[PDB]
Amino acid sequence: IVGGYTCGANTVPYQVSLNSGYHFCGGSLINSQWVVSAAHCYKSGIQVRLGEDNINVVEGNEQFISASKSIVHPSYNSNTLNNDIMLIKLKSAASLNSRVASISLPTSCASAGTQCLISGWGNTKSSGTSYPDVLKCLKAPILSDSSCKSAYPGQITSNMFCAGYLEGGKDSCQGDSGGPVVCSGKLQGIVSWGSGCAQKNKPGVYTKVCNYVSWIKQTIASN
Ligand SMILES: NC(=[NH2+])c1ccc2[nH]c(-c3ncccc3[O-])nc2c1
Ligand SMILES: [Ca+2]
Numbered sequence: 642i643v644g645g646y647t648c649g650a651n652t653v654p655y656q657v658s659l660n661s662g663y664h665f666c667g668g669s670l671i672n673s674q675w676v677v678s679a680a681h682c683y684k685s686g687i688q689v690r691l692g693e694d695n696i697n698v699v700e701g702n703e704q705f706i707s708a709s710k711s712i713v714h715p716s717y718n719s720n721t722l723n724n725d726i727m728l729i730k731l732k733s734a735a736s737l738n739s740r741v742a743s744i745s746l747p748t749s750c751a752s753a754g755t756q757c758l759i760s761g762w763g764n765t766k767s768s769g770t771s772y773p774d775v776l777k778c779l780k781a782p783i784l785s786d787s788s789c790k791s792a793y794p795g796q797i798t799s800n801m802f803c804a805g806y807l808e809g810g811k812d813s814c815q816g817d818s819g820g821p822v823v824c825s826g827k828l829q830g831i832v833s834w835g836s837g838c839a840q841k842n843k844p845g846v847y848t849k850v851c852n853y854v855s856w857i858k859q860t861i862a863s864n
Contacts, residue, residue, distance in 0.1 A: 644811030645779035650694035667820025678819035750851035757824035763816025805844035814838030
């Protein structure tokens with residue numbers, strides 16, 4: 642997260658870290674056995690880490706559970722990143738409490754102007770790599786579709802939305818991929834891509850979760 646602040650241990654109880662010997666992506670807990678992340682974060686050998694704050698120290702509240710299966714959306718395109726969403730089922734359910742909690746799926750899409758919270762352990766520099774130990778937060782608004790399409794002409798599908806600051810300085814970055822964009826208590830986006838990090842006129846692009854709620858409910862219901 643570039644231009645963000647330290648969230649505070651366990652203030653974001655639905656944030657998960659996807660780990661394969663190191664942190665590589667974020668994700669959101671939506672029920673005690675399912676996590677939603679981005680299809681480009683897929684790999685085998687994923688351990689889901691819940692109740693995390695400092696990812697390099699065990700401090701208490703952490704739950705490490707291995708993933709039983711990862712379901713990348715059947716229509717995910719790795720060249721356009723359209724349908725960039727993946728569901729991970731956990732080997733055992735997580736114990737929920739106030740430090741580990743699920744986030745709700747939306748009942749409607751959000752409008753531009755809505756302010757949202759983006760969090761993650763990804764890069765905090767736009768030029769160079771500086772990964773934090775603790776979780777960083779950034780509050781960003783959803784931009785209008787014209788500013789998003791004018792920024793990435795021909796690269797935005799209707800399953801993507803832009804959120805961020807056109808003046809630059811604040812944005813999500815690598816390491817944040819797969820993580821949450823929560824607005825008014827609902828999971829509205831997933832960190833998917835952007836051109837560099839925090840660059841002027843290059844806002845972040847997120848998977849528009851409101852378009853996958855029926856798919857998520859049907860896939861969890863049949864697995
Ligand atoms: N500007 C953003 N909001 C953003 C978000 C996620 C990213 N992930 C990446 C990224 N991911 C994997 C390898 C290199 C990257 O620059 N760039 C990213 C940029
Ligand atoms: Ca820790």
